[PDB]
Amino acid sequence: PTHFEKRFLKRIRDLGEGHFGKVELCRYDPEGDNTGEQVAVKSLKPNHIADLKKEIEILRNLYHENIVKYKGICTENGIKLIMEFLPSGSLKEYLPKNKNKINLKQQLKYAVQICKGMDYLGSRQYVHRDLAARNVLVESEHQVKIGDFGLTKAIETDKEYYTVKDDRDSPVFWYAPECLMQSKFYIASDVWSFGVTLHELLTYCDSDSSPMALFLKMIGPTHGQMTVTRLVNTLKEGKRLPCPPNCPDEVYQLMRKCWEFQPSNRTSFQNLIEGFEALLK
Ligand SMILES: CCCS(=O)(=O)N[C@H]1C[C@@H](N(C)c2ncnc3[nH]ccc23)C1
Questions:
Q1: Is the CB of residue 118 below 6 angstroms from any atom belonging to ligand 1?
Q2: Which of 71, 131, 148, 169 has most ligand 1 atoms within 8 Å of its beta carbon, as the pocket-test mutant?
Q3: What does the record say mutating residue 42 to A does?
């Protein structure tokens, strides 16, 4: 049930790619008649096998309505992670195609669902470290799920954070000051990334309004080396992503509470759930 044979995983197309990992759409077809189920397969790009094993162990341990469902594994010396496939794809793919169909009420319900999924992940003592719209999957127009855990780490025992020893290519434009200045990741650091994801969601994932595009227009291009320093300085000055068009004051105030410079001053996911639900009538 949880073991998928590689020869029967018929490649269809790519769903997404990282630096060292890729997610592909496959049809698991053991009958050879093309009636098999479509699944999302995460593997290693052409090791790092230990990190995919950790991700598998994390996802197998998560059971929640707003978290992509683990289905099993496929072995090669190598390993692949098998997950349910959500045909509507990420919010980055879905929102620009459905701008007219999705109103503020629906966006706020997605924000509650992501916070519920994140609060559940935090209760398991994990930090996601990669919360962005590209990682939020659309199950239906009424439901979303957190769909990738490639950077997820277990919080160091009796500590409030995880210290990254690598961070090779990480989503710096979604990162809190403590991640950028000290490589320390708190549950509060995910709260900051959430505020950035909420900003993406409210702009319908418009590429011109993306966190990278906006910050590249605020700071200016330098590439690779000085980007993080110039981002830290911009954040120290009190500059934040602006209020999206048609975002009400009440929603922006919640978003701004995700963006307090100090981790201890930020709102929690439980407070965000209650705050958004109070706006839903
Ligand atoms: C290492 C690559 C990270 S990434 O590319 O930034 N995001 C992931 C691609 C995936 N995604 C769009 C999916 N689309 C459809 N069904 C799905 N099930 C499970 C996943 C998934 C999330």
A1: no
A2: 148
A3: Loss of protein tyrosine kinase activity
